[PDB]
Amino acid sequence: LTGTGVLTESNKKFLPFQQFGRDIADTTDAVRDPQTLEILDITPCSFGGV
């Protein structure tokens, strides 16, 4: 699963079988690191109109 984002610490406690996390809009906003079993939130990289 590839993408671009800011990976921050997450307060979402996954169940042990779950790896990624999705919101209402079917975008990956939570993920589990495979090396160390910790949960990371994926904020999209900052963008805006100029």
């Binding site: 671009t4 975008t27 963008f47 805006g48 109109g49």
Partner: protein
Amino acid sequence: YTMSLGAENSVAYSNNSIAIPTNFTISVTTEILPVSMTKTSVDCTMYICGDSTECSNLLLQYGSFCTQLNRALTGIAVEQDKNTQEVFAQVKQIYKTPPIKDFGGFNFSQILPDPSKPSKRSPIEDLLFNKVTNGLTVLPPLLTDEMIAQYTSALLAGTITSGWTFGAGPALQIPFPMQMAYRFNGIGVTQNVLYENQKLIANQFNSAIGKIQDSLSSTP
């Protein structure tokens, strides 16, 4: 079932009989009208392609579709602000009520702004605000909710203290039981009827305003 339009009311018509009202009800009714939408803006290039440069290179073959979509959304976004400007900003003078609320028995506390609330909203307006719950951006409206509440407060102060005179020129002060008598004469009822029964009309008006607040608080 087959539905029924209404109850049958055979009017007692004859060629020499009339029905004359002997009393009246001061009735307050609500009318809700939408004014603007959420101003949405879409980055067309980021929505179609994201950060892929090959996708944008292929998207440049289709020309100025993204420019047309952005310009249409910009036109909608400025049209919402124009709609709010035409609806609420009909006065250029910000009126205030006097500190003493002596209006001949008429109570406007449910529609005047509450000084205890930081949002400076009326209790009815506060209830109304409580009852409403990838390249995408939401532009904020040009007028904030505090300034729209300020515009409605100015309109209420003008129509309470000055009648319809502030909408046609300078605000000319007039007592409210006189303003009401003028309105009574506008619908073809004599001033004396208003003056003699002013306590009953004020009580009916306050009861109807309270029933409006109760009906808004009790209907989802």
